[PDB]
Nucleic acid binder design. Structure first.
Lengths: 217, 101, 83, 129, 71, 132, 25, 221
RNA sequence: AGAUACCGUCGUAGUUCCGACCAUAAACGAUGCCGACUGGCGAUGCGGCGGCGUUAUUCCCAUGACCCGCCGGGCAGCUUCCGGGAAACCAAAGUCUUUGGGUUCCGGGGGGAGUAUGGUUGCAAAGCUGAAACUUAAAGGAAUUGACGGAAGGGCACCACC
């Protein structure tokens, strides 16, 4: 990630970041998130510096591939925007996904049948998934989170400055990490791109679910 | 045991505010303590508002409203059921009740 | 710990937070042992060893666990000094 | 007002250590302060510090390590004999292994063990461990 | 202590000399009122003449007639 | 007060998630399936349970119900879970970029590209909601 | 017994004592 | 009879993969199965009931009493724990508190008073703990001095391996619940107090959960 | 039941002003003052600095009125595992057995008692100063679970009513 020209963000990625709108952050700002913002434009919207978003994106990918067994890395999402992105992240890497309704006590209660003991927990949103982050304190559990300019950084052990509001954006970095986590360990060649399309991770509105059907019928 | 942080009144930097009289009783309550209620009502609600309309020589005549500012004491505001006791953590919330009708 | 004879006498030596240099206690269940993987530059694959760190539960609970990890990555050259 | 200047300096760098700051700024710089910081620096309890000497009472920026438990100041500056110096470090220092009582003597400002070697006491300034 | 001046000895000492009187045990030991009111007068024992045998009642649910003498 | 207890509701969901094809919609036939696919000790429970599975059918053809696993409609979900359009929602040459963003890109080496169209900054700071 | 009426009752008694004592001077 | 593990940490200690209990402390891993401790320290480790406290709650029909058991536990060398359990039956509370006491044993750092000859006898520093209002202090003492303290924390200190120590208690020490918790908090701070000895940079050993990551997919879930 | 009370009708002193006294209030933030340090966040008042645009004089610059920020201190608020606290709670009630920035006042179980007495101030009412004998094993603080409420909100019963 550090001055190694193989791992610098290439031109096709930035066109994905601009089209998906990941550089556009929230209206207000967290005092912890001033490290990753370029400047607050007029109309009161901050700009997340993508170059500093790319460096954290790789840094997060270093931690995952460092974990030997790809199963014991929980990937969670409670907001409707992230479930579809995290089941195909955990299917592409080999992680165990958690889609919605994180029942409190899946990390600290043994008698539970849903008792999981992961080594690393990556989250879509610190606010929406505030519960599992707390359980990440009762057990020694490093944490990753697709943070926004407003998201708090309590118990977050490494953050990815992103826009976790738009569906087109959330699925993108679940598609972004998917490439790098499979590019560190030999799965994909970095020369020709990934065959998996970033639209696959996007969250589909039930409205657009049945609005494209007659476009196919 | 201190119940409210603001002592149940809006006085923060004054030391003394002028009192007002309650509307039901004549109780002297500090102006920032009294439960104030500002009511905007027509002089006629539903039974009269119709048959007054055609009885008016001026047709399409907007009926005037009645502007009254009520000042209740804590005892009267409670007995009149304008405010009611809340749980310890529901006390802290100070947004007015929802307004839809 | 030593004695005058020159003997290590404690039963175990505790860890120390890689950011605040505070001893991570035996019951600090909010501490982490994160492992950052390095990458050979030319081919860009996973080499095999790590760049392990250790964060105490306190700064995590405070909010500088991600900023500390970032500064440690810069000190070891994992994150580009340009950043 | 600001009566004791060494007290404001120590309490600030003691507060900033509990919070975990990397380097702290202290507003007034006095001759006794820089002489006090060197006694702590020569034992490894603090890092490299710097004096921003303007045309007024200068400011000091002290690089902090994680090695300082507490650096208190004893006020007022009591007189210490060599007979009662053991009784001070008996109820002021954590243990007999580490910790130092900084006290000024006619020979200068040094810890309590150097005051044992030079065999002269003096007024007590503070303590750090 | 509140004032930690280097030469506030007469201020500290006069304070304790003053505040000591608010200690109930100390105030009775350093005033004649407790010693004059004592029928013994600081003596551990005393001889007297019994002049009648009176029975004293008990107070709380512990009920009985305690046998005493008026010396 | 005809409210079904859990032991009626619990057993009524289990057969539907296991015999969704054999049971039907009218009360009487899927009443007859229940004594064969579940040993019920009483006759009223046989009708109580059968009475609820009939009610759950006209909830199933109207859409999915939350707690159930019907091997037909979660595959309706799965085929909607891997749909991929012919073109990307990223493949735009019409990416409206604002005048203040590209200097951040100009602050990078990806400063001047081809398919980026600059917009105009809407003048007049107006983004906060009115207080109170 | 309010602490205010004991202060009023004791002021009425303390005032009555000032008179019974004054008529002897 | 025999034990089957539930926690992935408990899997390894039944496979003799984990050498001792200290490498669990070194990574601050939460032990959540009591049979991990009796595997390492299960013979020389002794128990001690401190006091049976009959708390009560009021109901519309009399008082509902349930007994509270304070158990101090630990071998008389380096380790000590303290469990408290409240059950309706006294026998059930004592048996239950022993289980919690083992899940909370912590290593005590024993030090020297002045001359570092022989084996450590006393506390390394002036450490103090506090629970509620009780504030108990621990002062290093010379050899052959004994534990100078009240009978209540004396047992916790004798079960910790410390043989010489001065103490000073402030607050309502009549509440054994806080007066026993307080000393346990002080004893727990011996390995959290930074000493100029513990200044060398930590060479990080690889976690036992990672160093045995292949043994966790080979035989079980 | 009685009401020398609550309720109602009158109504004196007073309530108002001027000039002298009085010096007490739950005179309360029940929280001495001065100084330093230790998280954010959105507002707000005054002054200053900067900045697109909008609107007023109109004839623009400059001034107003908005709009976006920054600085100082001011009343506050929200938030939090700063830390503290018996807890309620507190960015101070924190930096306290790791105990010492400076300095005033002031407390030592409950009563007796802010009483007696002496002194002093005042026209008086009273204020300030201020004991003891004797009595007593508790008084008290915060919080919990119950019971209770001529407290509130939902619901129920012909051993309740309609």
């Amino acid at each position: 990630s550090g001055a190694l020209d193989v791992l610098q963000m290439k031109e096709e990625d930035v066109l994905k970041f601009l089209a998906a709108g990941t550089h556009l952050g929230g209206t207000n700002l967290d005092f912890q998130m001033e490290q990753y913002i370029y400047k607050r434009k007029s109309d009161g919207i901050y700009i997340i510096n993508l170059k500093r978003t790319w460096e954290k994106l790789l840094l997060a990918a270093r931690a995952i591939v460092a974990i030997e067994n790809p199963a014991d890395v929980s990937v969670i999402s409670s907001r409707n925007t992230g479930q579809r992105a995290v089941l195909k992240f955990a299917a592409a890497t080999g992680a165990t996904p958690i889609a919605g309704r994180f029942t409190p006590g899946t990390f600290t209660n043994q008698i539970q049948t849903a008792f999981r003991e992961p080594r690393l927990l990556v989250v879509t949103d610190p606010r929406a998934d505030h519960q599992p982050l707390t359980e990440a304190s009762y057990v020694n559990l490093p944490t990753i989170a697709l943070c926004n300019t407003d998201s708090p950084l309590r118990y977050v052990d490494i953050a990815i400055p992103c826009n976790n509001k738009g569906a087109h954006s959330v699925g993108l970095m679940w598609w972004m990490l998917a490439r790098e986590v499979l590019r560190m360990r030999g799965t994909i060649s970095r020369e020709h791109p990934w065959e998996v399309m970033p639209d696959l991770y996007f969250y589909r509105d039930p409205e657009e679910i049945e609005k494209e059907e007659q476009a196919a019928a | 045991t201190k119940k409210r942080r603001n002592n149940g009144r809006a006085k923060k930097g004054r030391g003394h505010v002028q009192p007002i009289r309650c509307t039901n009783c004549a109780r002297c309550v500090p102006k920032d303590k009294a439960i104030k209620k500002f009511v905007i009502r027509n002089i006629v609600e539903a039974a009269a508002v119709r048959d007054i309309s055609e009885a008016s020589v001026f047709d399409a005549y907007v009926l005037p409203k009645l502007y009254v500012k009520l000042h209740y004491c804590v005892s009267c505001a409670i007995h009149s059921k304008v405010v009611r006791n809340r749980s310890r953590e529901a006390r802290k919330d100070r947004t007015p009740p929802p307004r839809f009708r | 710990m030593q004695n005058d004879a020159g003997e290590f006498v404690d039963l175990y030596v505790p860890r120390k937070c890689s950011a605040s240099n505070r001893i991570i206690g035996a019951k600090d269940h909010a501490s982490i042992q994160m492992n950052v993987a390095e990458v050979d530059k030319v081919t860009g694959r996973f080499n095999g060893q790590f760049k392990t760190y250790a964060i105490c539960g306190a700064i995590r609970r405070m909010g500088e666990s991600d900023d500390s990890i970032l500064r440690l990555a810069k000190a070891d050259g994992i994150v580009s000094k340009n950043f | 007002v600001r009566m004791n200047v060494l007290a404001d300096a120590l309490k600030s760098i003691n507060n900033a250590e509990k919070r975990g700051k990397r380097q702290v700024l202290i507003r007034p710089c006095s001759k006794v302060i820089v002489r006090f910081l060197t006694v702590m620096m020569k034992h490894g309890y603090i890092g490299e510090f710097e004096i921003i000497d303007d045309h007024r009472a200068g400011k000091i920026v002290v690089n902090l390590t994680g090695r300082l438990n507490k650096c208190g100041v004893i006020s007022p500056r009591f007189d210490v004999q060599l007979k009662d110096l053991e009784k001070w470090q008996n109820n002021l220092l954590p243990s007999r292994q580490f910790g130092f009582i900084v006290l000024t003597t006619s020979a200068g400002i040094m810890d309590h063990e150097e005051a044992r070697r030079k065999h002269t006491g003096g007024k007590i300034l503070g303590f750090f461990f | 202590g509140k004032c930690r001046g280097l030469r506030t000895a007469r201020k500290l000492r006069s304070h304790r000399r003053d505040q000591k009187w608010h200690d109930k045990q100390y105030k009775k030991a350093h005033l004649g009122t407790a010693l004059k009111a004592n029928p013994f007068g600081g003596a551990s024992h005393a001889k007297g003449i019994v002049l009648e045998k009176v029975g004293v009642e008990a107070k709380q649910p512990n009920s009985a007639i305690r046998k005493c003498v008026r010396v | 007060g005809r409210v079904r207890t859990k032991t009626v509701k619990k057993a009524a969901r289990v057969i539907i998630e296991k015999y969704y094809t054999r049971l039907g919609n009218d009360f009487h036939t899927n009443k007859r399936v229940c004594e064969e696919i579940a040993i019920i000790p009483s006759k009223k429970l046989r009708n109580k349970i059968a009475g609820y599975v009939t009610h759950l059918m006209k909830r199933i053809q109207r859409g999915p119900v939350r707690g159930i696993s019907i091997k037909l409609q979660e595959e309706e979900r799965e085929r909607r879970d891997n749909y991929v359009p012919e073109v990307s929602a990223l493949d735009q040459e019409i990416i409206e970029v604002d005048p203040d963003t590209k200097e951040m890109l100009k602050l990078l080496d990806f400063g001047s590209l081809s398919n980026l169209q600059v917009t105009q900054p809407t003048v007049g700071m107006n983004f906060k909601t009115p207080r109170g | 017994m309010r602490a205010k009426w004991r202060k009023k009752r004791m002021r009425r008694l303390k005032r009555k004592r000032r008179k019974m004592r004054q008529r002897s001077k | 009879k025999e034990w089957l593990p539930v926690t992935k940490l408990g899997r390894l200690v039944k496979d003799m993969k984990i050498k001792s209990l200290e490498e669990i402390y070194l990574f601050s891993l939460p032990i959540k199965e009591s049979e991990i401790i009796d595997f390492f320290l299960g013979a020389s480790l002794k128990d001690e009931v401190l006091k049976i406290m009959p708390v009560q709650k009021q109901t519309r029909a009399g008082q509902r009493t349930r007994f509270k058991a304070f158990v101090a536990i630990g071998d008389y060398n380096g380790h000590v724990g303290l469990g408290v359990k409240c059950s309706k039956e006294v026998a059930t509370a004592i048996r239950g508190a022993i289980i919690l006491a083992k899940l909370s044993i912590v290593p005590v750092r024993r030090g020297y008073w002045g001359n570092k000859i022989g084996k450590p006898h006393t506390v390394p520093c002036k450490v103090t703990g506090r629970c509620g209002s009780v504030l108990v202090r621990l002062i290093p003492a010379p050899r052959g001095t004994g534990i100078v303290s009240a009978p209540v924390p004396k047992k916790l200190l004798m079960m910790a391996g410390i043989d010489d120590c001065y103490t000073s208690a402030r607050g309502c020490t009549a509440t054994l619940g806080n007066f026993a918790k307080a000393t346990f908090d002080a004893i727990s701070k011996t390995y959290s107090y930074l000493t100029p000895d513990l200044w060398k940079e930590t060479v990080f050993t690889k976690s036992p959960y990672q160093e045995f990551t292949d043994h966790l997919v080979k035989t079980h879930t």
